[PDB]
């Protein structure tokens, strides 16, 4: 039945934040192996043909990618199922536009055009700090990158801003109570706030509290916290809404009172 | 414990060496044999009878080669008839939903008791940790023995 690895993905089993239909067909892109996990990524074909409407079928996105137009983190990706993920930078210089994949408020990626001067660095969360042969310190970030010789005062869960062209860690933020952060998993997928607490359970799943810019509090696991600023000051540019998560009642009030129908 | 060599091979702790040294560093009081032991963590304290006393148990948590991780359960001792192995019973209640009522159930566990503990007898309460498969039907190790209940170990004058 299953003697080896699988290579198909059914449309009904694909992640839900891809916001796919159910009548096009039985199958889904099935992102190829990459630096981001399968359930937490966003393939190139879905970002180009579904959210940007640049293409209309799979052939069109294939022949858009086969012209060396799309650059993910500086390098030119030719695959149409490459798993782009959190805090990535897309660049299409034929039209002069850059994006940044970040969860907006409702647990899905947004379209978040940024200035070309901001599409040079990216923030990365440290997952591992080990020592190699001859006592050389290494890093491992949330997107599989490995850095040799980091300054010996960066530890786990800290954030490092790296130059996209050279690697070469530039600056870093420390995991401490008072630092801006965005939640990247669970139920609060997208909300932004300050830490103010870190509960510790030796042996399993140390939980962390957060309190956003309106006095609302919510907790998560330490595995889903992402420090993105020193405090009340983001280092990357925030999307529209800024991870506030206004309730359904306030949603309805603002959608009705503003009468957001058209221009 | 005067002679712990009872099987057909020399029992000795690994990572411990019988070294080159002079005459009369001790003819009795320093017999040149240190003790390997580790702390389990999670707040459990290594008993002094594992640090002082001598025995060879590779499957002991405090001196042997085994790592405690995962779940931590507890129970009462029901049988001590195997070598370094005891049988403990865990009772619980199972809630049926049709009726709004519970029912009594029980599970048995074979668990490993290090020679570090020498006071255990049927009726004690025992904490356990989760280890790799240690035999066909053993996956847990006794971390702590306690008996602080009625009809105590003996007359209460402590």
């Amino acid at each position: 039945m299953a003697r080896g690895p699988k290579k198909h993905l059914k449309r009904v089993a694909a992640p839900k934040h891809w916001m796919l239909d159910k009548l096009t067909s039985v199958f889904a892109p099935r992102p190829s192996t990459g630096p981001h996990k399968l359930r937490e990524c966003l393939p190139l074909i879905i970002f180009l043909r579904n959210k940007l409407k640049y293409a209309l079928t799979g052939d069109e996105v294939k022949k858009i990618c086969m012209q060396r137009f799309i650059k993910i983190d500086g390098k030119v990706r030719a695959d149409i199922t490459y798993p782009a993920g959190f805090m990535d930078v897309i660049s299409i210089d034929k039209t002069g536009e850059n994006f940044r994949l970040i969860y907006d408020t409702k647990g899905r990626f947004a379209v978040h055009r940024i200035t070309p001067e901001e599409a040079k660095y990216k923030l990365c969360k440290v997952r591992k700090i080990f020592v190699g042969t001859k006592g050389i310190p290494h890093l491992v970030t949330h997107d599989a990158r490995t850095i040799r010789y980091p300054d010996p005062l960066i530890k786990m869960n800290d954030t490092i801003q790296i130059d996209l062209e050279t690697g070469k860690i530039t600056d870093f933020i420390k995991f401490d109570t008072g630092n801006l952060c965005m939640v990247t998993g669970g139920a609060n997928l997208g909300r932004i706030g300050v830490i103010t607490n870190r509960e510790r359970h030796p042996g399993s799943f140390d939980v962390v509290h957060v309190k956003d810019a309106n006095g609302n509090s919510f907790a998560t696991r330490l595995s889903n916290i992402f420090v993105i600023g020193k405090g009340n000051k983001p280092w990357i540019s925030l999307p529209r809404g800024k991870g506030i998560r206004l309730t359904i009642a306030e949603e309805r009030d603002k959608r009705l009172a503003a009468k957001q129908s058209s221009g | 414990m005067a002679d712990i060599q009872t099987e057909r091979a020399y029992q000795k702790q690994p990572t411990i060496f019988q070294n080159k040294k002079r005459v009369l560093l001790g003819e009795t009081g320093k017999e040149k044999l240190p003790r390997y032991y580790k702390n389990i963590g999670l707040g459990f304290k290594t008993p002094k009878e594992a640090i002082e006393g001598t025995y060879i148990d590779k499957k002991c948590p405090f001196t042997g080669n085994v790592s405690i991780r995962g779940r931590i359960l507890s129970g009462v001792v029901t049988k001590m008839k195997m070598q370094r192995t005891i049988v403990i019973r865990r009772d619980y209640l199972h809630y049926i939903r049709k009726y709004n009522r519970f029912e009594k159930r029980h599970k048995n566990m074979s668990v490993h008791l290090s020679p570090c503990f020498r006071d255990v007898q049927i009726g004690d309460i025992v904490t356990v940790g989760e280890c790799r498969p240690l035999s066909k039907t053993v996956r847990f190790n006794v971390l702590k023995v306690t008996k602080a209940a009625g009809t105590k170990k003996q007359f209460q004058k402590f």
């Binding site: - | 020399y10 070294n19 080159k20 066909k136």
Partner: protein, 206 residues
């Protein structure tokens, strides 16, 4: 073929269990090596993932060590004396981990006499006249006090070990699995291990 699965066993209650599937490959056989002593032959098995694995047959040379001295040399394996698991593994001279073997003891003698400038167990001295007293009583005025008198005091090999060096053999324990690596390494017995194994050997045979 041969299988290491758990599902042919009775469950803890003593009840049978029925199979649900045919034998897999991640549950394999590959019969035993049964390493004898003789000129080297080594076969190679392809295992899960690639990762060739050397199965030895008829090894005759090992890499043994003397831990008091921190002196390890290549040596020849002569015979097997004790085996804690079975007794038919000494009748057939099959060489497994934690076996008790006799080795040649010569390179340790060479290193000792060279390092300490002092003899091992020797009966009489005539062979030392053309050679060997050349090494042991080297004709030099520099060093031969200051260095070798700091080598002395320490050069006190125990009774059993210096008794070993007379018959030309030692007693060693294998600490590597020749069936998996193809090497027969180990360490020479000393102290209480030596006493225990010597008493066991003396008590078993004869």
């Amino acid at each position: 073929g041969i299988s290491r699965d758990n599902w042919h066993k009775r469950r803890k209650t003593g009840g049978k269990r029925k199979p649900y599937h045919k034998k897999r490959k991640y549950e394999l056989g590959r019969p035993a090596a049964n390493t004898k002593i003789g000129p080297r032959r080594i076969h190679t098995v392809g295992v899960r993932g690639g990762n060739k694995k050397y199965r030895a047959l008829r090894l005759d040379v090992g890499n043994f060590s003397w831990g008091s001295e921190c002196c390890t040399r290549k040596t020849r394996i002569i015979d097997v004396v004790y085996n804690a698991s079975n007794n038919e593994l000494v009748r057939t001279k099959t060489l497994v981990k934690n076996c008790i073997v006799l080795i040649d003891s010569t390179p340790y003698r060479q290193w000792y006499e060279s390092h300490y400038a002092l003899p091992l167990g020797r009966k009489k001295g005539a062979k030392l006249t053309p050679e060997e007293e050349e090494i042991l009583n080297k004709k030099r005025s520099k060093k031969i006090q200051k260095k070798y008198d700091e080598r002395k005091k320490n050069a006190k090999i125990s009774s059993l070990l210096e008794e070993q060096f007379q018959q030309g053999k030692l007693l060693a324990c294998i600490a590597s699995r020749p069936g998996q690596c193809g090497r027969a390494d180990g360490y020479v017995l000393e102290g209480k291990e030596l006493e225990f194994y010597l008493r066991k050997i003396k008590a078993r045979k004869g």
